[PDB]
Amino acid sequence: PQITLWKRPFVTVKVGGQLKEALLDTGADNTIFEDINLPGRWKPKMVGGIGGFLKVREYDQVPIEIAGHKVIGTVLVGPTPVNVIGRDTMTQIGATLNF
Amino acid sequence: PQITLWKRPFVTVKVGGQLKEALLDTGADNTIFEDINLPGRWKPKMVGGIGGFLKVREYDQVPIEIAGHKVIGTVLVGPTPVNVIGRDTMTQIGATLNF
Ligand SMILES: COc1ccc(S(=O)(=O)N(C[C@H]2CCC(=O)N2)C[C@@H](O)[C@H](Cc2ccccc2)NC(=O)O[C@@H]2C[C@@H]3CCO[C@@H]3C2)cc1
Structure with missing residues (x-):
């Protein structure tokens, strides 16, 4: 997809066999x-x-299912107020910023 | 540009007439x-x-210029460890996240 940034960019991911939402x-x-x-x-x-x-x-x-791909890599767990997908994961699905 | 995310996505930014860099x-x-x-x-x-x-x-x-796009925006100033360009400004230059 092409995601505009007028709202927070959330995606659905599967981690630990559960559907989660993350920024x-x-x-x-x-x-x-x-x-x-x-x-x-x-x-x-x-x-x-x-x-x-x-x-x-x-x-x-560990595996994360994101954008229809299995990404295996590092995941941190802690009492963050918002789940976040960072560059470690995004590089594995070929995400880019376009301007 | 189209940039990947293997490194932190710093860009050159002119903000209030000062040349800086920000994520x-x-x-x-x-x-x-x-x-x-x-x-x-x-x-x-x-x-x-x-x-x-x-x-x-x-x-x-505040005037802000990124990649040749000049916009007028809100800028917060404070003890952040790293300068960041947020969604408010990115929408004004038409930036998108793609995968
Ligand atoms: C109101 O506008 C703002 C409010 C908060 C922030 S933030 O810097 O706290 N942050 C908000 C994110 C995190 C929580 C959320 O819901 N959205 C922007 C982040 O991109 C931030 C931007 C950032 C802040 C401080 C240092 C480095 C980058 N990165 C960050 O926290 O990354 C964590 C910290 C670790 C270092 C970088 O990667 C590691 C994982 C920025 C603007």
């Missing part, structure tokens, strides 16, 4: 969800946003 | 700079994201 965020390096169940082991990570740092669990090499 | 950020509602000085009065605003909240300085009616 396409080209200013986020990483993909971050709250309240989901990922496979495998995780390691602790801290992420620094506009207001300070956030403690998360990092799950490497 | 094209689809997850940002508004444009926020840390390293500019805009003249006159300002309205206080609170904004929030990962890690917490910050107080910013709302400056109204």
